[PDB]
Design an enzyme around this catalytic site. Structure first.
Site, PDB file in Angstrom:
ATOM      1  N   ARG A   1       8.263  14.176  -1.623  1.00  0.00           N
ATOM      2  CA  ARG A   1       8.792  14.947  -0.506  1.00  0.00           C
ATOM      3  C   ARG A   1       7.867  16.116  -0.205  1.00  0.00           C
ATOM      4  O   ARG A   1       7.413  16.840  -1.107  1.00  0.00           O
ATOM      5  CB  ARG A   1      10.190  15.467  -0.821  1.00  0.00           C
ATOM      6  CG  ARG A   1      11.029  15.786   0.408  1.00  0.00           C
ATOM      7  CD  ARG A   1      12.505  15.956   0.024  1.00  0.00           C
ATOM      8  NE  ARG A   1      12.794  15.410  -1.312  1.00  0.00           N
ATOM      9  CZ  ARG A   1      13.092  14.136  -1.572  1.00  0.00           C
ATOM     10  NH1 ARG A   1      13.165  13.247  -0.585  1.00  0.00           N
ATOM     11  NH2 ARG A   1      13.251  13.739  -2.834  1.00  0.00           N
TER      12      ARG A   1
ATOM     13  N   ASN B   1       8.206   9.678   0.966  1.00  0.00           N
ATOM     14  CA  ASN B   1       7.728   8.360   0.597  1.00  0.00           C
ATOM     15  C   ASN B   1       8.236   8.085  -0.812  1.00  0.00           C
ATOM     16  O   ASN B   1       8.481   9.013  -1.573  1.00  0.00           O
ATOM     17  CB  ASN B   1       6.188   8.274   0.648  1.00  0.00           C
ATOM     18  CG  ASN B   1       5.685   6.840   0.512  1.00  0.00           C
ATOM     19  OD1 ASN B   1       6.173   5.936   1.193  1.00  0.00           O
ATOM     20  ND2 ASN B   1       4.756   6.617  -0.398  1.00  0.00           N
TER      21      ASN B   1
ATOM     22  N   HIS C   1       9.791  -3.240   4.418  1.00  0.00           N
ATOM     23  CA  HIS C   1      10.254  -1.894   4.687  1.00  0.00           C
ATOM     24  C   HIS C   1      11.097  -1.381   3.535  1.00  0.00           C
ATOM     25  O   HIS C   1      11.933  -2.096   2.998  1.00  0.00           O
ATOM     26  CB  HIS C   1      11.073  -1.950   5.995  1.00  0.00           C
ATOM     27  CG  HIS C   1      11.923  -0.752   6.238  1.00  0.00           C
ATOM     28  ND1 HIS C   1      11.404   0.475   6.587  1.00  0.00           N
ATOM     29  CD2 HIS C   1      13.271  -0.596   6.190  1.00  0.00           C
ATOM     30  CE1 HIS C   1      12.392   1.341   6.733  1.00  0.00           C
ATOM     31  NE2 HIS C   1      13.534   0.711   6.495  1.00  0.00           N
ATOM     32  N   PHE C   2      10.836  -0.164   3.107  1.00  0.00           N
ATOM     33  CA  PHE C   2      11.627   0.429   2.041  1.00  0.00           C
ATOM     34  C   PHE C   2      12.725   1.206   2.764  1.00  0.00           C
ATOM     35  O   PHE C   2      12.445   2.120   3.551  1.00  0.00           O
ATOM     36  CB  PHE C   2      10.766   1.360   1.181  1.00  0.00           C
ATOM     37  CG  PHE C   2      11.504   1.939   0.015  1.00  0.00           C
ATOM     38  CD1 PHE C   2      12.288   3.081   0.167  1.00  0.00           C
ATOM     39  CD2 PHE C   2      11.467   1.306  -1.220  1.00  0.00           C
ATOM     40  CE1 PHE C   2      13.032   3.586  -0.888  1.00  0.00           C
ATOM     41  CE2 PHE C   2      12.215   1.812  -2.293  1.00  0.00           C
ATOM     42  CZ  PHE C   2      12.995   2.950  -2.117  1.00  0.00           C
ATOM     43  N   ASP C   3      13.973   0.808   2.551  1.00  0.00           N
ATOM     44  CA  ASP C   3      15.070   1.458   3.250  1.00  0.00           C
ATOM     45  C   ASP C   3      15.729   2.635   2.564  1.00  0.00           C
ATOM     46  O   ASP C   3      16.058   3.624   3.219  1.00  0.00           O
ATOM     47  CB  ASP C   3      16.131   0.437   3.644  1.00  0.00           C
ATOM     48  CG  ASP C   3      16.999   0.927   4.798  1.00  0.00           C
ATOM     49  OD1 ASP C   3      16.423   1.284   5.852  1.00  0.00           O
ATOM     50  OD2 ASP C   3      18.240   0.989   4.640  1.00  0.00           O
TER      51      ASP C   3
ATOM     52  N   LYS D   1       2.923  12.456   6.042  1.00  0.00           N
ATOM     53  CA  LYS D   1       4.149  11.667   6.050  1.00  0.00           C
ATOM     54  C   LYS D   1       5.119  12.518   5.225  1.00  0.00           C
ATOM     55  O   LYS D   1       4.824  12.870   4.097  1.00  0.00           O
ATOM     56  CB  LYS D   1       3.902  10.311   5.414  1.00  0.00           C
ATOM     57  CG  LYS D   1       5.124   9.445   5.379  1.00  0.00           C
ATOM     58  CD  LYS D   1       4.763   8.017   5.722  1.00  0.00           C
ATOM     59  CE  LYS D   1       5.932   7.096   5.456  1.00  0.00           C
ATOM     60  NZ  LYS D   1       6.175   6.956   3.995  1.00  0.00           N
ATOM     61  N   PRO D   2       6.284  12.861   5.788  1.00  0.00           N
ATOM     62  CA  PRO D   2       7.327  13.686   5.167  1.00  0.00           C
ATOM     63  C   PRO D   2       7.899  13.253   3.817  1.00  0.00           C
ATOM     64  O   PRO D   2       8.085  14.071   2.920  1.00  0.00           O
ATOM     65  CB  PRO D   2       8.428  13.723   6.238  1.00  0.00           C
ATOM     66  CG  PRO D   2       7.689  13.481   7.506  1.00  0.00           C
ATOM     67  CD  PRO D   2       6.732  12.387   7.111  1.00  0.00           C
TER      68      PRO D   2
ATOM     69  N   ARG E   1       0.813  -1.219   0.000  1.00  0.00           N
ATOM     70  CA  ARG E   1       0.000   0.000   0.000  1.00  0.00           C
ATOM     71  C   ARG E   1       0.850   1.273   0.000  1.00  0.00           C
ATOM     72  O   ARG E   1       0.550   2.237  -0.696  1.00  0.00           O
ATOM     73  CB  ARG E   1      -0.953   0.000   1.211  1.00  0.00           C
ATOM     74  CG  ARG E   1      -1.821   1.231   1.338  1.00  0.00           C
ATOM     75  CD  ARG E   1      -2.875   1.059   2.438  1.00  0.00           C
ATOM     76  NE  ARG E   1      -2.268   0.812   3.741  1.00  0.00           N
ATOM     77  CZ  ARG E   1      -1.783   1.756   4.542  1.00  0.00           C
ATOM     78  NH1 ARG E   1      -1.840   3.041   4.205  1.00  0.00           N
ATOM     79  NH2 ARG E   1      -1.248   1.427   5.703  1.00  0.00           N
TER      80      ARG E   1
ATOM     81  N   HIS F   1       4.163   1.600  -0.905  1.00  0.00           N
ATOM     82  CA  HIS F   1       5.226   1.733  -1.894  1.00  0.00           C
ATOM     83  C   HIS F   1       5.056   1.185  -3.285  1.00  0.00           C
ATOM     84  O   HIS F   1       5.873   1.493  -4.139  1.00  0.00           O
ATOM     85  CB  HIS F   1       6.526   1.117  -1.347  1.00  0.00           C
ATOM     86  CG  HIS F   1       6.919   1.638   0.002  1.00  0.00           C
ATOM     87  ND1 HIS F   1       7.411   2.913   0.194  1.00  0.00           N
ATOM     88  CD2 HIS F   1       6.904   1.050   1.222  1.00  0.00           C
ATOM     89  CE1 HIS F   1       7.677   3.091   1.480  1.00  0.00           C
ATOM     90  NE2 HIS F   1       7.374   1.974   2.123  1.00  0.00           N
TER      91      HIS F   1
END
Length: 124
Positions: A85, A44, A119-121, A41-42, A10, A12
């Site tokens: 951003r 993504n 998790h997207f790192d 959210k700052p 959802r 990414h």
């Protein structure tokens, strides 16, 4: 409740498009994906590839995550991605984002069985 794997999809995944088409892509997507529901959210990143190709990264180059964890993996090849951003005019609930298109390698953290991205790192 929503699984970490489902949350990853959802937040990414955007397999329905090859790249962001306009400067409003992030604004629409952040909203549609429910990422601005409690707060803006700052940052993504959306990945424009098949889910299968992204899940396959869990069997690619193992690398340490930004935080030191060792369950991260880097894609052998670059992928089409969109960076979102927050803009200086972003004000909850009217969150606003700058859309940036790019092509880079992605780094995700994997967990479970089947071993999938949770998790997207980072993108390099």
């Amino acid at each position: 409740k929503e699984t970490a794997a489902a949350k990853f999809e959802r937040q990414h995944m955007d397999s329905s498009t090859s790249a962001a088409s306009s400067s409003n892509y992030c604004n629409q997507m952040m909203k549609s994906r429910n990422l601005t529901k409690d707060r803006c959210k700052p940052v993504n990143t959306f990945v424009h590839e098949s889910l299968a190709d992204v899940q396959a990264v869990c069997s690619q180059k193992n690398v340490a995550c930004k935080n030191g964890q060792t369950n991260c993996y880097q894609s052998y090849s670059t992928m089409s991605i969109t960076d979102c951003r927050e803009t200086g005019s972003s004000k909850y609930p009217n969150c606003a984002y700058k859309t940036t298109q790019a092509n880079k390698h992605i780094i995700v953290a994997c967990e479970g069985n089947p071993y999938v991205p949770v998790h997207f790192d980072a993108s390099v």
